[PDB]
Amino acid sequence: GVIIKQGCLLKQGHRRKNWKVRKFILREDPAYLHYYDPAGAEDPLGAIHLRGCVVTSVEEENLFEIITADEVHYFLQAATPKERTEWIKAIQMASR
């Protein structure tokens, strides 16, 4: 799978609804969005199978959400609206 996009974002705790910085790597052959420790561990902390996902902005600034085909929800926060828009479209093209 080839790398499409790469960057850090704030991801909301599924858990206690907290927010944490993670490094995200979007790939396209296999449609996947992996997240790691904000550091340099390339062994992922989780994976998001993107095939058939739904990704939309959420009206905390620059929020957007990912809904997997089986309805697991991911809440992310970009640093700027331009970044958010870029991630959303990238994720959309990847799960083609």
mmCIF file of N, CA, C and O in Angstrom:
data_model
loop_
_atom_site.group_PDB
_atom_site.id
_atom_site.type_symbol
_atom_site.label_atom_id
_atom_site.label_comp_id
_atom_site.label_asym_id
_atom_site.label_seq_id
_atom_site.Cartn_x
_atom_site.Cartn_y
_atom_site.Cartn_z
ATOM 1 N N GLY A 1 0.822 -1.194 0.000
ATOM 2 C CA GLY A 1 0.000 0.000 0.000
ATOM 3 C C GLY A 1 0.863 1.254 0.000
ATOM 4 O O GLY A 1 1.781 1.383 0.806
ATOM 5 N N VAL A 2 0.582 2.199 -0.877
ATOM 6 C CA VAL A 2 1.421 3.379 -0.911
ATOM 7 C C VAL A 2 0.852 4.535 -0.061
ATOM 8 O O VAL A 2 -0.350 4.752 0.015
ATOM 9 N N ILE A 3 1.793 5.241 0.549
ATOM 10 C CA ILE A 3 1.487 6.384 1.385
ATOM 11 C C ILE A 3 0.926 7.556 0.567
ATOM 12 O O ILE A 3 1.547 8.046 -0.377
ATOM 13 N N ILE A 4 -0.265 8.010 0.938
ATOM 14 C CA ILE A 4 -0.971 9.132 0.302
ATOM 15 C C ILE A 4 -0.820 10.509 1.020
ATOM 16 O O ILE A 4 -0.568 11.514 0.483
ATOM 17 N N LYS A 5 -1.044 10.435 2.380
ATOM 18 C CA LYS A 5 -0.885 11.553 3.218
ATOM 19 C C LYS A 5 -0.286 11.190 4.569
ATOM 20 O O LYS A 5 -0.422 10.058 5.044
ATOM 21 N N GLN A 6 0.361 12.163 5.192
ATOM 22 C CA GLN A 6 1.037 11.940 6.455
ATOM 23 C C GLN A 6 0.983 13.196 7.316
ATOM 24 O O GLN A 6 1.190 14.294 6.817
ATOM 25 N N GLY A 7 0.710 13.051 8.615
ATOM 26 C CA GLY A 7 0.675 14.212 9.479
ATOM 27 C C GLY A 7 0.084 13.926 10.847
ATOM 28 O O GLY A 7 -0.454 12.845 11.086
ATOM 29 N N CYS A 8 0.207 14.901 11.793
ATOM 30 C CA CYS A 8 -0.288 14.752 13.177
ATOM 31 C C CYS A 8 -1.600 15.480 13.376
ATOM 32 O O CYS A 8 -1.844 16.567 12.843
ATOM 33 N N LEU A 9 -2.467 14.856 14.174
ATOM 34 C CA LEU A 9 -3.759 15.420 14.474
ATOM 35 C C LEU A 9 -4.125 15.113 15.888
ATOM 36 O O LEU A 9 -3.464 14.330 16.567
ATOM 37 N N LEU A 10 -5.195 15.722 16.328
ATOM 38 C CA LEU A 10 -5.672 15.483 17.680
ATOM 39 C C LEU A 10 -6.810 14.472 17.536
ATOM 40 O O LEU A 10 -7.731 14.677 16.743
ATOM 41 N N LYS A 11 -6.740 13.374 18.274
ATOM 42 C CA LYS A 11 -7.797 12.373 18.200
ATOM 43 C C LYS A 11 -8.479 12.267 19.549
ATOM 44 O O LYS A 11 -7.812 12.184 20.579
ATOM 45 N N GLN A 12 -9.808 12.284 19.545
ATOM 46 C CA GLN A 12 -10.555 12.230 20.803
ATOM 47 C C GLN A 12 -10.558 10.843 21.403
ATOM 48 O O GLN A 12 -10.697 9.844 20.690
ATOM 49 N N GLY A 13 -10.391 10.780 22.717
ATOM 50 C CA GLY A 13 -10.393 9.515 23.372
ATOM 51 C C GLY A 13 -11.738 8.826 23.222
ATOM 52 O O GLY A 13 -12.768 9.327 23.662
ATOM 53 N N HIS A 14 -11.688 7.673 22.604
ATOM 54 C CA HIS A 14 -12.856 6.839 22.508
ATOM 55 C C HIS A 14 -13.417 6.630 23.922
ATOM 56 O O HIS A 14 -14.614 6.667 24.199
ATOM 57 N N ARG A 15 -12.417 6.412 24.788
ATOM 58 C CA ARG A 15 -12.422 6.116 26.223
ATOM 59 C C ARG A 15 -13.187 7.069 27.169
ATOM 60 O O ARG A 15 -14.337 6.861 27.527
ATOM 61 N N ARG A 16 -12.462 8.124 27.551
ATOM 62 C CA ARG A 16 -12.912 9.152 28.467
ATOM 63 C C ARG A 16 -13.181 10.465 27.770
ATOM 64 O O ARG A 16 -13.340 11.511 28.411
ATOM 65 N N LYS A 17 -13.232 10.436 26.444
ATOM 66 C CA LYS A 17 -13.457 11.621 25.641
ATOM 67 C C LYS A 17 -12.364 12.678 25.800
ATOM 68 O O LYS A 17 -12.643 13.875 25.732
ATOM 69 N N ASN A 18 -11.137 12.213 26.012
ATOM 70 C CA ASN A 18 -10.022 13.106 26.164
ATOM 71 C C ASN A 18 -9.458 13.346 24.745
ATOM 72 O O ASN A 18 -9.964 12.767 23.795
ATOM 73 N N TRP A 19 -8.432 14.178 24.595
ATOM 74 C CA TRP A 19 -7.856 14.384 23.248
ATOM 75 C C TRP A 19 -6.357 14.103 23.312
ATOM 76 O O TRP A 19 -5.687 14.492 24.271
ATOM 77 N N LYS A 20 -5.833 13.418 22.301
ATOM 78 C CA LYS A 20 -4.408 13.091 22.270
ATOM 79 C C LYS A 20 -3.829 13.323 20.868
ATOM 80 O O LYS A 20 -4.533 13.197 19.858
ATOM 81 N N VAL A 21 -2.525 13.666 20.797
ATOM 82 C CA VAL A 21 -1.857 13.893 19.508
ATOM 83 C C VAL A 21 -1.380 12.594 18.967
ATOM 84 O O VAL A 21 -0.730 11.817 19.674
ATOM 85 N N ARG A 22 -1.680 12.339 17.736
ATOM 86 C CA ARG A 22 -1.196 11.132 17.162
ATOM 87 C C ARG A 22 -0.690 11.462 15.793
ATOM 88 O O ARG A 22 -1.062 12.464 15.181
ATOM 89 N N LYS A 23 0.186 10.591 15.318
ATOM 90 C CA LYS A 23 0.770 10.705 13.994
ATOM 91 C C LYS A 23 -0.097 9.809 13.106
ATOM 92 O O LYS A 23 -0.344 8.651 13.452
ATOM 93 N N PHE A 24 -0.582 10.347 11.989
ATOM 94 C CA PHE A 24 -1.427 9.586 11.083
ATOM 95 C C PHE A 24 -0.758 9.329 9.749
ATOM 96 O O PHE A 24 -0.100 10.206 9.191
ATOM 97 N N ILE A 25 -0.941 8.121 9.234
ATOM 98 C CA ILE A 25 -0.398 7.765 7.938
ATOM 99 C C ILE A 25 -1.512 7.138 7.107
ATOM 100 O O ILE A 25 -2.039 6.080 7.452
ATOM 101 N N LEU A 26 -1.869 7.810 6.016
ATOM 102 C CA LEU A 26 -2.919 7.351 5.115
ATOM 103 C C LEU A 26 -2.288 6.614 3.934
ATOM 104 O O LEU A 26 -1.373 7.129 3.297
ATOM 105 N N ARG A 27 -2.779 5.409 3.653
ATOM 106 C CA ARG A 27 -2.296 4.610 2.539
ATOM 107 C C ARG A 27 -3.459 4.347 1.596
ATOM 108 O O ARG A 27 -4.596 4.531 1.993
ATOM 109 N N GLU A 28 -3.202 3.930 0.362
ATOM 110 C CA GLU A 28 -4.314 3.776 -0.580
ATOM 111 C C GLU A 28 -4.498 2.395 -1.169
ATOM 112 O O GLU A 28 -5.637 1.963 -1.281
ATOM 113 N N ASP A 29 -3.442 1.681 -1.558
ATOM 114 C CA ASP A 29 -3.690 0.330 -2.088
ATOM 115 C C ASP A 29 -4.630 -0.316 -1.063
ATOM 116 O O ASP A 29 -5.828 -0.361 -1.276
ATOM 117 N N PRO A 30 -4.102 -0.846 0.013
ATOM 118 C CA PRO A 30 -5.052 -1.156 1.076
ATOM 119 C C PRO A 30 -5.607 0.187 1.597
ATOM 120 O O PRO A 30 -4.791 0.986 2.063
ATOM 121 N N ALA A 31 -6.917 0.498 1.557
ATOM 122 C CA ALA A 31 -7.350 1.820 2.077
ATOM 123 C C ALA A 31 -7.287 1.832 3.614
ATOM 124 O O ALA A 31 -8.183 1.314 4.272
ATOM 125 N N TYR A 32 -6.213 2.430 4.166
ATOM 126 C CA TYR A 32 -5.981 2.457 5.608
ATOM 127 C C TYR A 32 -5.412 3.755 6.151
ATOM 128 O O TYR A 32 -4.583 4.389 5.514
ATOM 129 N N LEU A 33 -5.878 4.126 7.336
ATOM 130 C CA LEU A 33 -5.429 5.286 8.066
ATOM 131 C C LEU A 33 -4.909 4.772 9.415
ATOM 132 O O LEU A 33 -5.706 4.475 10.297
ATOM 133 N N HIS A 34 -3.590 4.664 9.582
ATOM 134 C CA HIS A 34 -3.005 4.195 10.846
ATOM 135 C C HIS A 34 -2.584 5.375 11.691
ATOM 136 O O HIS A 34 -2.199 6.420 11.167
ATOM 137 N N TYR A 35 -2.657 5.206 13.012
ATOM 138 C CA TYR A 35 -2.194 6.280 13.897
ATOM 139 C C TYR A 35 -1.143 5.733 14.860
ATOM 140 O O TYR A 35 -1.242 4.581 15.290
ATOM 141 N N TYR A 36 -0.153 6.554 15.191
ATOM 142 C CA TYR A 36 0.927 6.122 16.056
ATOM 143 C C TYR A 36 1.089 7.036 17.248
ATOM 144 O O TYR A 36 0.368 8.015 17.401
ATOM 145 N N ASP A 37 2.111 6.765 18.076
ATOM 146 C CA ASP A 37 2.510 7.691 19.115
ATOM 147 C C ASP A 37 3.092 8.931 18.412
ATOM 148 O O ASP A 37 3.757 8.819 17.374
ATOM 149 N N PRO A 38 2.771 10.086 18.997
ATOM 150 C CA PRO A 38 3.251 11.364 18.463
ATOM 151 C C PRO A 38 4.770 11.349 18.198
ATOM 152 O O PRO A 38 5.287 12.203 17.496
ATOM 153 N N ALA A 39 5.434 10.366 18.772
ATOM 154 C CA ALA A 39 6.859 10.176 18.653
ATOM 155 C C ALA A 39 7.227 9.402 17.390
ATOM 156 O O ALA A 39 6.626 9.578 16.332
ATOM 157 N N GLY A 40 8.215 8.515 17.517
ATOM 158 C CA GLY A 40 8.666 7.772 16.365
ATOM 159 C C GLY A 40 8.514 6.256 16.493
ATOM 160 O O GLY A 40 9.409 5.511 16.124
ATOM 161 N N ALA A 41 7.411 5.798 16.989
ATOM 162 C CA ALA A 41 7.218 4.370 17.028
ATOM 163 C C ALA A 41 6.493 4.028 15.743
ATOM 164 O O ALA A 41 5.362 4.469 15.581
ATOM 165 N N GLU A 42 7.060 3.279 14.834
ATOM 166 C CA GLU A 42 6.199 3.115 13.694
ATOM 167 C C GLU A 42 5.273 1.943 13.865
ATOM 168 O O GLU A 42 4.497 1.630 12.950
ATOM 169 N N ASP A 43 5.335 1.301 14.990
ATOM 170 C CA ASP A 43 4.354 0.295 15.203
ATOM 171 C C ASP A 43 3.134 1.069 15.701
ATOM 172 O O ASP A 43 3.150 1.725 16.745
ATOM 173 N N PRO A 44 2.053 0.963 14.892
ATOM 174 C CA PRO A 44 0.780 1.639 15.152
ATOM 175 C C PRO A 44 0.124 1.402 16.472
ATOM 176 O O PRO A 44 0.306 0.374 17.113
ATOM 177 N N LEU A 45 -0.690 2.365 16.858
ATOM 178 C CA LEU A 45 -1.454 2.258 18.070
ATOM 179 C C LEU A 45 -2.860 1.824 17.645
ATOM 180 O O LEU A 45 -3.702 1.509 18.491
ATOM 181 N N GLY A 46 -3.144 1.816 16.323
ATOM 182 C CA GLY A 46 -4.455 1.397 15.812
ATOM 183 C C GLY A 46 -4.542 1.568 14.280
ATOM 184 O O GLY A 46 -3.691 2.210 13.661
ATOM 185 N N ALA A 47 -5.568 0.971 13.683
ATOM 186 C CA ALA A 47 -5.763 1.037 12.250
ATOM 187 C C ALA A 47 -7.222 1.297 11.917
ATOM 188 O O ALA A 47 -8.127 0.821 12.599
ATOM 189 N N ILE A 48 -7.445 2.042 10.851
ATOM 190 C CA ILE A 48 -8.802 2.315 10.447
ATOM 191 C C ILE A 48 -8.974 1.876 8.998
ATOM 192 O O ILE A 48 -8.439 2.514 8.079
ATOM 193 N N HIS A 49 -9.696 0.768 8.808
ATOM 194 C CA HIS A 49 -9.992 0.239 7.481
ATOM 195 C C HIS A 49 -10.931 1.288 6.885
ATOM 196 O O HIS A 49 -12.011 1.526 7.424
ATOM 197 N N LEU A 50 -10.528 1.921 5.786
ATOM 198 C CA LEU A 50 -11.345 3.016 5.212
ATOM 199 C C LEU A 50 -12.423 2.598 4.178
ATOM 200 O O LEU A 50 -13.274 3.402 3.819
ATOM 201 N N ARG A 51 -12.376 1.346 3.708
ATOM 202 C CA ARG A 51 -13.352 0.926 2.697
ATOM 203 C C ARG A 51 -14.798 1.026 3.148
ATOM 204 O O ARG A 51 -15.262 0.266 3.979
ATOM 205 N N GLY A 52 -15.502 2.000 2.564
ATOM 206 C CA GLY A 52 -16.901 2.288 2.807
ATOM 207 C C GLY A 52 -17.140 3.239 3.984
ATOM 208 O O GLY A 52 -18.255 3.312 4.500
ATOM 209 N N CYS A 53 -16.102 3.961 4.427
ATOM 210 C CA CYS A 53 -16.258 4.878 5.535
ATOM 211 C C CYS A 53 -16.940 6.145 5.107
ATOM 212 O O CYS A 53 -17.030 6.447 3.909
ATOM 213 N N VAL A 54 -17.444 6.889 6.082
ATOM 214 C CA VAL A 54 -18.073 8.168 5.799
ATOM 215 C C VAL A 54 -17.289 9.184 6.593
ATOM 216 O O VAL A 54 -17.043 8.991 7.773
ATOM 217 N N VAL A 55 -16.883 10.287 5.962
ATOM 218 C CA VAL A 55 -16.092 11.302 6.659
ATOM 219 C C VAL A 55 -16.678 12.705 6.430
ATOM 220 O O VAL A 55 -16.819 13.153 5.293
ATOM 221 N N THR A 56 -16.996 13.387 7.525
ATOM 222 C CA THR A 56 -17.607 14.709 7.436
ATOM 223 C C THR A 56 -17.118 15.711 8.471
ATOM 224 O O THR A 56 -16.609 15.338 9.514
ATOM 225 N N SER A 57 -17.271 17.013 8.182
ATOM 226 C CA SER A 57 -16.888 18.041 9.139
ATOM 227 C C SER A 57 -17.918 18.032 10.257
ATOM 228 O O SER A 57 -19.051 17.619 10.055
ATOM 229 N N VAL A 58 -17.519 18.481 11.438
ATOM 230 C CA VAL A 58 -18.442 18.545 12.569
ATOM 231 C C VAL A 58 -18.547 19.999 12.997
ATOM 232 O O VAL A 58 -17.537 20.644 13.261
ATOM 233 N N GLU A 59 -19.775 20.502 13.040
ATOM 234 C CA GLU A 59 -20.048 21.901 13.380
ATOM 235 C C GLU A 59 -20.176 22.072 14.890
ATOM 236 O O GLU A 59 -20.074 21.100 15.647
ATOM 237 N N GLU A 60 -13.994 23.843 20.460
ATOM 238 C CA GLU A 60 -13.174 22.961 19.639
ATOM 239 C C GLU A 60 -13.313 23.314 18.171
ATOM 240 O O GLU A 60 -14.408 23.261 17.599
ATOM 241 N N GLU A 61 -12.186 23.681 17.566
ATOM 242 C CA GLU A 61 -12.126 24.113 16.179
ATOM 243 C C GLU A 61 -11.625 23.040 15.206
ATOM 244 O O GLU A 61 -10.765 22.218 15.534
ATOM 245 N N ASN A 62 -12.187 23.043 14.004
ATOM 246 C CA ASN A 62 -11.759 22.152 12.930
ATOM 247 C C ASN A 62 -11.894 20.674 13.262
ATOM 248 O O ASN A 62 -10.959 19.887 13.082
ATOM 249 N N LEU A 63 -13.099 20.319 13.655
ATOM 250 C CA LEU A 63 -13.421 18.956 13.995
ATOM 251 C C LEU A 63 -13.967 18.247 12.776
ATOM 252 O O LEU A 63 -14.625 18.860 11.915
ATOM 253 N N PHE A 64 -13.701 16.964 12.669
ATOM 254 C CA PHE A 64 -14.252 16.159 11.602
ATOM 255 C C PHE A 64 -14.280 14.720 12.064
ATOM 256 O O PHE A 64 -13.416 14.284 12.835
ATOM 257 N N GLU A 65 -15.295 14.010 11.574
ATOM 258 C CA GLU A 65 -15.484 12.652 12.039
ATOM 259 C C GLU A 65 -15.453 11.550 10.979
ATOM 260 O O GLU A 65 -15.907 11.739 9.857
ATOM 261 N N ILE A 66 -14.914 10.369 11.353
ATOM 262 C CA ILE A 66 -14.823 9.230 10.470
ATOM 263 C C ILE A 66 -15.759 8.157 11.004
ATOM 264 O O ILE A 66 -15.722 7.839 12.190
ATOM 265 N N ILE A 67 -16.586 7.605 10.128
ATOM 266 C CA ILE A 67 -17.509 6.543 10.497
ATOM 267 C C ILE A 67 -17.165 5.364 9.609
ATOM 268 O O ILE A 67 -17.347 5.431 8.383
ATOM 269 N N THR A 68 -16.679 4.273 10.198
ATOM 270 C CA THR A 68 -16.304 3.078 9.430
ATOM 271 C C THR A 68 -17.546 2.352 8.890
ATOM 272 O O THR A 68 -18.684 2.672 9.265
ATOM 273 N N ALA A 69 -17.329 1.373 8.012
ATOM 274 C CA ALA A 69 -18.432 0.613 7.429
ATOM 275 C C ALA A 69 -19.258 -0.126 8.477
ATOM 276 O O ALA A 69 -20.417 -0.462 8.236
ATOM 277 N N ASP A 70 -18.679 -0.395 9.641
ATOM 278 C CA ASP A 70 -19.410 -1.074 10.679
ATOM 279 C C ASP A 70 -19.790 -0.108 11.785
ATOM 280 O O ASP A 70 -20.224 -0.520 12.866
ATOM 281 N N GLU A 71 -19.600 1.179 11.500
ATOM 282 C CA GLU A 71 -19.987 2.268 12.419
ATOM 283 C C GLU A 71 -19.193 2.405 13.721
ATOM 284 O O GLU A 71 -19.781 2.412 14.801
ATOM 285 N N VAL A 72 -17.854 2.359 13.517
ATOM 286 C CA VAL A 72 -16.963 2.738 14.645
ATOM 287 C C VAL A 72 -16.728 4.218 14.378
ATOM 288 O O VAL A 72 -16.417 4.576 13.251
ATOM 289 N N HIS A 73 -16.861 5.081 15.401
ATOM 290 C CA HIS A 73 -16.685 6.545 15.175
ATOM 291 C C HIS A 73 -15.372 7.134 15.660
ATOM 292 O O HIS A 73 -14.952 6.883 16.782
ATOM 293 N N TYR A 74 -14.769 7.911 14.814
ATOM 294 C CA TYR A 74 -13.520 8.567 15.168
ATOM 295 C C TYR A 74 -13.660 10.071 15.066
ATOM 296 O O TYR A 74 -14.095 10.602 14.043
ATOM 297 N N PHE A 75 -13.280 10.751 16.139
ATOM 298 C CA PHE A 75 -13.342 12.199 16.184
ATOM 299 C C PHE A 75 -11.954 12.791 16.179
ATOM 300 O O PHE A 75 -11.159 12.576 17.107
ATOM 301 N N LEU A 76 -11.685 13.554 15.126
ATOM 302 C CA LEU A 76 -10.394 14.204 14.939
ATOM 303 C C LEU A 76 -10.498 15.722 14.923
ATOM 304 O O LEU A 76 -11.578 16.253 14.707
ATOM 305 N N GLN A 77 -9.397 16.404 15.158
ATOM 306 C CA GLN A 77 -9.345 17.846 15.183
ATOM 307 C C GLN A 77 -8.087 18.286 14.426
ATOM 308 O O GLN A 77 -6.991 17.868 14.764
ATOM 309 N N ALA A 78 -8.260 19.123 13.406
ATOM 310 C CA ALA A 78 -7.145 19.621 12.628
ATOM 311 C C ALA A 78 -6.691 20.928 13.253
ATOM 312 O O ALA A 78 -7.379 21.485 14.115
ATOM 313 N N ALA A 79 -5.544 21.424 12.809
ATOM 314 C CA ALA A 79 -5.009 22.674 13.331
ATOM 315 C C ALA A 79 -5.646 23.881 12.613
ATOM 316 O O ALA A 79 -5.749 24.956 13.189
ATOM 317 N N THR A 80 -6.067 23.695 11.363
ATOM 318 C CA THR A 80 -6.695 24.759 10.587
ATOM 319 C C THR A 80 -7.765 24.180 9.689
ATOM 320 O O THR A 80 -7.706 23.009 9.298
ATOM 321 N N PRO A 81 -8.750 25.043 9.305
ATOM 322 C CA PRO A 81 -9.814 24.520 8.415
ATOM 323 C C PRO A 81 -9.248 23.979 7.088
ATOM 324 O O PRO A 81 -9.720 22.964 6.544
ATOM 325 N N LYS A 82 -8.212 24.635 6.579
ATOM 326 C CA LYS A 82 -7.608 24.171 5.337
ATOM 327 C C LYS A 82 -7.071 22.742 5.533
ATOM 328 O O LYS A 82 -7.245 21.903 4.655
ATOM 329 N N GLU A 83 -6.444 22.469 6.681
ATOM 330 C CA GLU A 83 -5.904 21.133 6.938
ATOM 331 C C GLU A 83 -7.029 20.103 7.029
ATOM 332 O O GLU A 83 -6.953 19.010 6.462
ATOM 333 N N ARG A 84 -8.081 20.463 7.746
ATOM 334 C CA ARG A 84 -9.228 19.589 7.888
ATOM 335 C C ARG A 84 -9.775 19.216 6.516
ATOM 336 O O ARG A 84 -9.977 18.031 6.216
ATOM 337 N N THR A 85 -10.025 20.227 5.685
ATOM 338 C CA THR A 85 -10.567 19.972 4.353
ATOM 339 C C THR A 85 -9.660 19.009 3.587
ATOM 340 O O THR A 85 -10.141 18.066 2.960
ATOM 341 N N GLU A 86 -8.354 19.245 3.653
ATOM 342 C CA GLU A 86 -7.378 18.398 2.979
ATOM 343 C C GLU A 86 -7.425 16.948 3.451
ATOM 344 O O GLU A 86 -7.336 16.025 2.648
ATOM 345 N N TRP A 87 -7.548 16.739 4.757
ATOM 346 C CA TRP A 87 -7.612 15.378 5.276
ATOM 347 C C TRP A 87 -8.898 14.680 4.847
ATOM 348 O O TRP A 87 -8.883 13.508 4.466
ATOM 349 N N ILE A 88 -10.009 15.400 4.909
ATOM 350 C CA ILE A 88 -11.286 14.816 4.535
ATOM 351 C C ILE A 88 -11.304 14.346 3.082
ATOM 352 O O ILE A 88 -11.690 13.216 2.799
ATOM 353 N N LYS A 89 -10.876 15.199 2.161
ATOM 354 C CA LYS A 89 -10.868 14.809 0.761
ATOM 355 C C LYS A 89 -9.880 13.663 0.526
ATOM 356 O O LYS A 89 -10.171 12.734 -0.236
ATOM 357 N N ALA A 90 -8.722 13.711 1.183
ATOM 358 C CA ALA A 90 -7.720 12.653 1.021
ATOM 359 C C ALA A 90 -8.293 11.311 1.466
ATOM 360 O O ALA A 90 -8.126 10.310 0.773
ATOM 361 N N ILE A 91 -8.958 11.299 2.618
ATOM 362 C CA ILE A 91 -9.577 10.086 3.147
ATOM 363 C C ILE A 91 -10.678 9.596 2.196
ATOM 364 O O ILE A 91 -10.868 8.392 2.002
ATOM 365 N N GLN A 92 -11.397 10.532 1.590
ATOM 366 C CA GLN A 92 -12.439 10.151 0.658
ATOM 367 C C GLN A 92 -11.896 9.488 -0.599
ATOM 368 O O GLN A 92 -12.464 8.496 -1.052
ATOM 369 N N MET A 93 -10.808 10.022 -1.155
ATOM 370 C CA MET A 93 -10.210 9.431 -2.356
ATOM 371 C C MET A 93 -9.598 8.069 -2.055
ATOM 372 O O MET A 93 -9.653 7.165 -2.880
ATOM 373 N N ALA A 94 -9.013 7.921 -0.872
ATOM 374 C CA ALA A 94 -8.371 6.664 -0.496
ATOM 375 C C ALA A 94 -9.346 5.465 -0.449
ATOM 376 O O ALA A 94 -8.978 4.364 -0.878
ATOM 377 N N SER A 95 -10.570 5.653 0.051
ATOM 378 C CA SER A 95 -11.550 4.571 0.231
ATOM 379 C C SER A 95 -12.419 4.268 -1.007
ATOM 380 O O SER A 95 -13.400 3.531 -0.940
ATOM 381 N N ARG A 96 -12.015 4.960 -2.097
ATOM 382 C CA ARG A 96 -12.671 4.990 -3.436
ATOM 383 C C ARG A 96 -13.598 3.836 -3.618
ATOM 384 O O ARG A 96 -14.184 3.697 -4.782
#
